[PDB]
Amino acid sequence: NAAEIRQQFAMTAGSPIIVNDKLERYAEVRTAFTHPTSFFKPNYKGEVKPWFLSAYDEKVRQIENGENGPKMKAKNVGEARAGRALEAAGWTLDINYGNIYPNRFFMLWSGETMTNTQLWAPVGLDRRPPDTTDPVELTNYVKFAARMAGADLVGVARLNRNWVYSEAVTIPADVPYEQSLHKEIEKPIVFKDVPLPIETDDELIIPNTCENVIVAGIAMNREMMQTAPNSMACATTAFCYSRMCMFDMWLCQFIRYMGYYAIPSCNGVGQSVAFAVEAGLGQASRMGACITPEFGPNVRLTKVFTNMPLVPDKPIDFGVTEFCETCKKCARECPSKAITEGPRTFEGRSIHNQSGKLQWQNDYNKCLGYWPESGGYCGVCVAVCPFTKGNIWIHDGVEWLIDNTNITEVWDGKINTYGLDADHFRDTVSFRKDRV
Amino acid sequence: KNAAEIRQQFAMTAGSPIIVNDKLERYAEVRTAFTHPTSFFKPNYKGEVKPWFLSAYDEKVRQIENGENGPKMKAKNVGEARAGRALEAAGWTLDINYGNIYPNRFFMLWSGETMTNTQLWAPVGLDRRPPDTTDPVELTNYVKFAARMAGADLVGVARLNRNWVYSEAVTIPADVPYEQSLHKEIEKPIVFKDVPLPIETDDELIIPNTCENVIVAGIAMNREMMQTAPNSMACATTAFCYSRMCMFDMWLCQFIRYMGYYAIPSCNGVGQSVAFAVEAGLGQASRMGACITPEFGPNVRLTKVFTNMPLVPDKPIDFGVTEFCETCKKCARECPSKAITEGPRTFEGRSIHNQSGKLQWQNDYNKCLGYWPESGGYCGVCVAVCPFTKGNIWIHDGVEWLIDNTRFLDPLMLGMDDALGYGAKRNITEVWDGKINTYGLDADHFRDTVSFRKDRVK
Ligand code: SF4
Ligand code: SF4
Ligand code: SF4
Numbered sequence: 001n002a003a004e005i006r007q008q009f010a011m012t013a014g015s016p017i018i019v020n021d022k023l024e025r026y027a028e029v030r031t032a033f034t035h036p037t038s039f040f041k042p043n044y045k046g047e048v049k050p051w052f053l054s055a056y057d058e059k060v061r062q063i064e065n066g067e068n069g070p071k072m073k074a075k076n077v078g079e080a081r082a083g084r085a086l087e088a089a090g091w092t093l094d095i096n097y098g099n100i101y102p103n104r105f106f107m108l109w110s111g112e113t114m115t116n117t118q119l120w121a122p123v124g125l126d127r128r129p130p131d132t133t134d135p136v137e138l139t140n141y142v143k144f145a146a147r148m149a150g151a152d153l154v155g156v157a158r159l160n161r162n163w164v165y166s167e168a169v170t171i172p173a174d175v176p177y178e179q180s181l182h183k184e185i186e187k188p189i190v191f192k193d194v195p196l197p198i199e200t201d202d203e204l205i206i207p208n209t210c211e212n213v214i215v216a217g218i219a220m221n222r223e224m225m226q227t228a229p230n231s232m233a234c235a236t237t238a239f240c241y242s243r244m245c246m247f248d249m250w251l252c253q254f255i256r257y258m259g260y261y262a263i264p265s266c267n268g269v270g271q272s273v274a275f276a277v278e279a280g281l282g283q284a285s286r287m288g289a290c291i292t293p294e295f296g297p298n299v300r301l302t303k304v305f306t307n308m309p310l311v312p313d314k315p316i317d318f319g320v321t322e323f324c325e326t327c328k329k330c331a332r333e334c335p336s337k338a339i340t341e342g343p344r345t346f347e348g349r350s351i352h353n354q355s356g357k358l359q360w361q362n363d364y365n366k367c368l369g370y371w372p373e374s375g376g377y378c379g380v381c382v383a384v385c386p387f388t389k390g391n392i393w394i395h396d397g398v399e400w401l402i403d404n405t406n407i408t409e410v411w412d413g414k415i416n417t418y419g420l421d422a423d424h425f426r427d428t429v430s431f432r433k434d435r436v
Numbered sequence: 437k438n439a440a441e442i443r444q445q446f447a448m449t450a451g452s453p454i455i456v457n458d459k460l461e462r463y464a465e466v467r468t469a470f471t472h473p474t475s476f477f478k479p480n481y482k483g484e485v486k487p488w489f490l491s492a493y494d495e496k497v498r499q500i501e502n503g504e505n506g507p508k509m510k511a512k513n514v515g516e517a518r519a520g521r522a523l524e525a526a527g528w529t530l531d532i533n534y535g536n537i538y539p540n541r542f543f544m545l546w547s548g549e550t551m552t553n554t555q556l557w558a559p560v561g562l563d564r565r566p567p568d569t570t571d572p573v574e575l576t577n578y579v580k581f582a583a584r585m586a587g588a589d590l591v592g593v594a595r596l597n598r599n600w601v602y603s604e605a606v607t608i609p610a611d612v613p614y615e616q617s618l619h620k621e622i623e624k625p626i627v628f629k630d631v632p633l634p635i636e637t638d639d640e641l642i643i644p645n646t647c648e649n650v651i652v653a654g655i656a657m658n659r660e661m662m663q664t665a666p667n668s669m670a671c672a673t674t675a676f677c678y679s680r681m682c683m684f685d686m687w688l689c690q691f692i693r694y695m696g697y698y699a700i701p702s703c704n705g706v707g708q709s710v711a712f713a714v715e716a717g718l719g720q721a722s723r724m725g726a727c728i729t730p731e732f733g734p735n736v737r738l739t740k741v742f743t744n745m746p747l748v749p750d751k752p753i754d755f756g757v758t759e760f761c762e763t764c765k766k767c768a769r770e771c772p773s774k775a776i777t778e779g780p781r782t783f784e785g786r787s788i789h790n791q792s793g794k795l796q797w798q799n800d801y802n803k804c805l806g807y808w809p810e811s812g813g814y815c816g817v818c819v820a821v822c823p824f825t826k827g828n829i830w831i832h833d834g835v836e837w838l839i840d841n842t843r844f845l846d847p848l849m850l851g852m853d854d855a856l857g858y859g860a861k862r863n864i865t866e867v868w869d870g871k872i873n874t875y876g877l878d879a880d881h882f883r884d885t886v887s888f889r890k891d892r893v894k
């Protein structure tokens with residue numbers, strides 16, 4: 001069982017991320033998705049375009065010649081398009097691959113204008129002062145709410161401001177969706193003595209009272225992900241981004257209706273993996289993702305920031321670091337050779353990494369480069385990780401221990417609600433005991 | 437227990453199992469208790485006549501200030517009472533005015549053209565590309581797979597029966613913004629014409645004659661929370677599943693469109709969900725009026741998508757519900773408003789809220805809605821006490837599967853269930869402190885809804 005596993009590998013209170021003096025907050029524009037030097041990539045006819053447009057070309061090409069991925073032939077043209085139809089559908093509740101613009105579209109920093117809030121205004125739940133201030137009872141309430149909202153994993157940590165972007169990528173408040181990509185701007189994220197989260201024309205302002213972050217893990221489908229870098233892997237990625245959006249909205253509304261404020265984020269606002277590691281969901285790995293006991297790295301992350309008093313969870317150490325030191329599988333299988341085979345350092349490999357923190361240093365410009373080549377979001381590194389396999393935790397009597405030992409059949413094979421697997425769904429059952 | 441085995445075993449021959457007569461006409465959505473003049477208004481606890489959801493609101497606030505989780509049922513404290521109502525209100529985030537019934541508005545868009553997702557993906561042109569698949573058998577496997585991805589616990593296909601489609605829908609005019617929606621609801625006919633795509637005009641909502649099929653989805657509610665009916669945690673699992681309903685429809689409509697066909701979302705709108713669910717083989721109609729399923733009983737919500745995509749209809753199911761309801765009267769006896777009849781099925785509606793012309797148990801739904809502002813929720817006691825909800829019902833004698841009527845008949849088993857139900861209403865704290873899992877699903881029964889190709893299409 002998983003509950004015993006997490007208590008068994010609990011650490012003493014603190015932050016597991018080692019930093020030095022050179023650490024500064026990271027500007028979101030530096031990511032490979034947004035940075036000028038990485039944002040444009042050639043398509044297969046050599047034309048230089050935004051990476052996802054170049055990726056769209058490869059998708060249309062593959063469909064036309066009956067492929068499910070880079071020279072992976074499909075059963076027929078029918079199958080090939082059905083995979084991309086599912087992929088595209090999955091993104092229904094996500095803006096521009098990630099929902100990163102703060103206080104725009106689904107990611108509103110206040111609930112006041114939402115249709116839900118207006119409907120319930122007579123009850124006045126979002127104006128009534130909180131009836132609970134006890135962090136223990138609130139931690140239980142909000143974690144129960146989080147599971148209702150579709151989190152497979154959830155944890156709580158104090159907000160480490162090092163991981164919050166210095167400046168967010170966003171769009172001007174009067175720019176309609178259709179013009180968004182053309183008019184992306186940078187906007188500073190600052191902390192001040194104010195009662196509520198507020199956006200000026202100059203700044204995104206988070207109250208100094210914003211003590212806590214709630215991190216959620218949203219499980220991807222194992223069988224679909226292991227078809228990486230082909231289209232079914234893109235499809236499970238896509239559906240979970242929409243599940244991410246649902247989670248943030250659901251949870252923010254709960255937190256507001258309890259009498260607090262809440263800031264959603266999805267892929268924006270801050271660095272997810274760092275928050276997740278500090279909140280005890282898992283450990284950082286060679287590939288760069290947060291690896292969890294339940295799903296390995298085959299899980300998506302999202303985060304909510306709030307002033308609601310809560311109990312920080314303890315970080316976890318179940319041997320990921322030492323195992324990644326020996327295992328080189330993701331690095332060896334990476335089609336673009338983006339993942340380092342060397343040790344951890346404090347020095348960023350390029351503009352895309354945040355310097356001043358001990359991590360494995362990877363070339364994310366090389367990773368992005370492969371996506372127009374394969375016409376997707378790859379995910380081979382996730383697919384091949386031993387932790388992603390599902391039947392790897394064994395009990396030797398005393399302790400719990402880690403035993404350190406096709407698209408058509410996916411469409412024709414096992415599936416269940418939201419792509420969850422009933423063979424392992426017991427691992428994420430929760431009682432109050434494991435909530436606080 | 438094998439759910440696939442069971443559904444296989446109780447499969448019928450093709451043909452709508454809802455039996456009707458000559459006086460059956462299509463039904464005006466405004467006739468429901470939620471909307472109609474005669475039932476729409478209810479007195480709050482101070483005598484004041486208000487719209488029912490506003491009277492309910494009043495009872496909610498009263499319960500919070502008094503530390504109550506339900507009517508005359510005390511919470512642990514004021515904080516717990518508020519938390520239950522916060523969870524309820526939050527759950528509704530992706531739903532418009534309790535049901536998303538206005539067709540072609542907000543989330544229920546009949547075309548995908550204006551959606552941010554469709555615009556982002558426009559260069560791939562999946563919505564403009566004609567289908568690469570026309571074979572109904574493969575399309576059935578593809579769409580049920582996506583439906584499961586989209587959050588359905590149950591999915592079935594039926595040919596569309598227009599008898600169950602609302603003659604006129606309750607909606608708002610297009611130029612009206614949400615903030616005024618409640619104060620500007622109109623009626624608007626739904627017609628079937630020879631047109632290529634589903635379109636709305638100033639006067640009509642038009643569904644193409646090519647619209648051949650309806651896909652029906654079952655969305656499972658939480659057992660523990662429903663057992664607290666009529667208190668707040670039962671409201672919460674209801675609320676949350678409505679948002680799940682909404683996102684199912686959007687996900688699935690987009691998939692169908694990107695496959696080269698059109699799709700019409702509905703949630704609680706457009707047509708009668710229970711009728712489609714029965715014809716699509718999700719379950720059987722019951723005394724209380726719900727569709728009862730082998731996996732969840734009536735503790736499940738329904739939504740539906742209408743589409744021209746070629747599909748293999750499912751066989752209807754008969755696993756004995758009718759015969760069981762004919763002798764069991766538990767919901768009728770436990771219903772706080774006496775809305776549910778203890779009588780036999782007729783073709784005659786008891787009031788304007790019923791559709792005359794089809795054989796069913798006739799209940800008085802104005803009575804039902806009447807209890808909602810009293811308890812300050814959406815009740816659901818009928819669903820909570822139905823033995824089909826108890827999930828310990830299936831048994832294999834030796835040759836075949838069957839329902840264990842020990843649960844419907846044995847006084848000891850009934851005496852227990854009444855005791856556990858009595859405690860459940862008063863044990864909200866224990867729900868908060870107790871078992872939960874993703875989307876409120878339960879891992880002990882989650883295998884019941886595993887699916888392979890052989891059980892999606894035949
Ligand atoms: S996503 Fe693909 S290209 Fe990027 S690091 Fe992983 S394996 Fe390499
Ligand atoms: S594949 Fe091996 S080295 Fe890479 S992240 Fe997984 S365990 Fe670590
Ligand atoms: S409680 Fe009894 S009569 Fe009512 S729906 Fe359930 S089985 Fe039928």
Ligand code: SF4
Pocket residue numbers: 770771772773774775776803804805807814815816817818819
């Ligand atoms: S919801 Fe409550 S009042 Fe309405 S029919 Fe069911 S038991 Fe009776």
